[PDB]
């Protein structure tokens, strides 16, 4: 059934599972034409497919060529997500295929169900959580590889960097979702907070800065503060 606050710790047991987020698959800019009409220009996107237990991120880049000559692109985006996720599963060794795939938007259920008909024992689930994975393109290194791509391309990352050497997957996911929530609510502040100090660098093979344990505590408090402030501003509370 649906994933919600109640069954949250299920994410960190030893049943393989992936989150699929399609929010950045079909990405456009809107502009005015010479005659004054509106038109869209697609830019490159990505499927964010993430193992919340291990940090492995399967970033499938969606090259603007996919859309060439196609109609109803937002509907097609959903099916291309499902095609690509299904291909990813097929490409994994049996023992690595997920036992569940949790989609972050309910509109992906039917497309993914139809594409996984060959995998009847993989359960396709929705979720009631309001996960912030749309902010994935606020991570500089992910946005860079997406925007530079000249062809379809799968790029693999660990979204937790080396955090799991010192913290549990529960704690790692909570940090990830806090950071991403902050970046979604106020990118500029969130990014300022992460980089204010030039002496804390990002490893070439990492996505985030190499904070010590104590420095992560300060960071996380600053992100929480950011999120609460923005709420008051949104709702005048």
């Amino acid at each position: 059934g649906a994933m919600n606050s109640s069954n949250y710790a299920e994410l960190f047991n030893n049943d393989i599972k992936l989150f699929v987020d399609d929010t950045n698959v079909y990405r456009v800019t809107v502009h005015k034409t010479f005659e004054g009409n509106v038109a869209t220009k697609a830019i490159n996107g990505c499927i964010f497919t993430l193992n919340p237990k291990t940090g492995h991120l399967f970033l499938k880049i969606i090259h603007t060529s996919v859309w060439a000559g196609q109609k109803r692109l937002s509907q097609l985006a959903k099916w291309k997500t499902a095609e690509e996720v299904s291909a990813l599963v097929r490409s994994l060794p049996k023992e690595e295929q997920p036992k569940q795939i949790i989609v972050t938007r309910k509109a992906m259920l039917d497309p993914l169900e139809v594409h996984m008909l060959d995998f009847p024992n993989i359960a396709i689930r929705p979720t009631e959580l309001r996960l912030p994975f749309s902010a994935a393109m606020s991570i500089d290194k992910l946005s860079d590889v997406v925007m530079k791509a000249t062809e379809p391309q799968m790029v693999l990352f660990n979204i937790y960097d080396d955090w799991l050497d010192r913290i549990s997957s529960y704690t790692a996911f909570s940090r990830l979702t806090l950071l991403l929530r902050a970046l979604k609510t106020n990118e500029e502040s969130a990014k300022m907070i992460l980089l204010s100090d030039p002496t804390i660098t990002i490893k070439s093979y990492h996505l985030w800065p190499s904070f010590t344990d104590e420095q992560w505590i300060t960071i996380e408090s600053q992100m929480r503060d950011l999120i609460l402030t923005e709420y008051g501003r949104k709702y005048n509370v």
């Binding site: 097609l76 499902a82 139809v114 008909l117």
Partner: protein, 300 residues
């Protein structure tokens, strides 16, 4: 014109024949239904005065033999049976008519309703959905489940409708996942019509049979099947013109005939709103859309 005699009426029951029905009192001298039009299937059904659950009844065709009803006090229901002794059967039927203990099947001459509701229903096809090959007639009741219902428990008592499932390998060609889910024409036309039903008339026959069982017995899985087979057509972009026109007639007489008070459980809001208003064939059911809007605008 044919006759279905009754041995007796030991318990108070409401008897239906096709779209007609009569109240019969405990040990009332009721002894059958005469003047039953030859040429169509028919259905006789029962609802006991003491148990307004389990409506039950028998599909039959009088060209296939001489049939009669007898109350069984052990199993406690009216049972249909065949008389093999043709002489002995004409004898009973004449004596009961002579004594005028039979109701006459009350067809208005102007009325094509029953024909319209059974145009494509064949008795041979019914006996494949309701498998009991020692009898020439078929028993159906409120509680019988379908083969598809069972898959998600007794098979001898199942309604073996054709299984339709929009999210199955059968329904979706590998590599046409999106195309085939959004546009079911290949499932309708190749898999179901050419493959399984062979032609539209058998397809329409199961659809009408499923409707009738939902109406007369409240059989839930039959309702499920009626709506699936409507939805498969309406969700197909490419459908033969003759089928659309016939479908519009078929549905019209089904909606027309439905008890008004039952539109809440017999009509699936989603399917109808999608068929009439969103589907490929939104514009191809003009009669069915007009009667639905004038008679059940709430569901829509």
């Amino acid at each position: 014109m044919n006759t279905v005699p009754f041995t007796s009426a030991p318990i108070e029951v409401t008897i239906g024949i096709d779209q007609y029905s009569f109240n019969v009192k405990e040990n009332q001298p009721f002894h059958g239904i005469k003047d039953i039009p030859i040429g169509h299937v028919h259905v006789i059904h029962f609802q006991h005065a003491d148990n307004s659950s389990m409506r039950y009844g028998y599909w039959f065709d009088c060209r296939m033999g001489n049939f009669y009803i007898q109350y069984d006090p052990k199993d406690g229901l009216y049972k249909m049976m065949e008389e093999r002794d043709g002489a002995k059967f004409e004898n009973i039927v004449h004596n009961f008519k002579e004594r005028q203990m039979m109701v006459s099947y009350p067809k208005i001459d102007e009325d094509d309703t029953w024909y319209n509701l059974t145009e494509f229903v064949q008795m041979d096809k019914i006996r494949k959905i309701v498998r009991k090959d020692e009898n020439q007639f078929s028993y159906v009741d409120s509680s019988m489940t379908t083969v598809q219902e069972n898959e998600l428990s007794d098979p001898a008592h199942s309604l073996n409708y054709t299984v339709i499932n929009f999210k199955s390998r059968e329904a979706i060609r590998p590599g046409h996942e999106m195309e085939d889910f959004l546009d079911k024409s290949y499932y309708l036309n190749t898999v179901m019509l050419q493959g399984i039903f062979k032609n539209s008339s058998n397809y329409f026959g199961e659809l009408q049979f499923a409707f009738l069982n939902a109406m007369f017995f409240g059989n839930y899985g039959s309702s499920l099947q009626w709506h699936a087979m409507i939805e498969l057509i309406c969700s197909s972009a490419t459908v033969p013109k003759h089928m659309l026109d016939k479908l519009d007639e078929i549905l019209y007489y089904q909606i027309k005939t439905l008890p008004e008070q039952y539109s809440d459980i017999l009509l699936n809001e989603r399917v109808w709103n999608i068929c009439l208003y969103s589907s490929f064939q939104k514009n191809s059911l003009h009669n069915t859309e007009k009667i639905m809007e004038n008679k059940y605008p709430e569901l829509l």
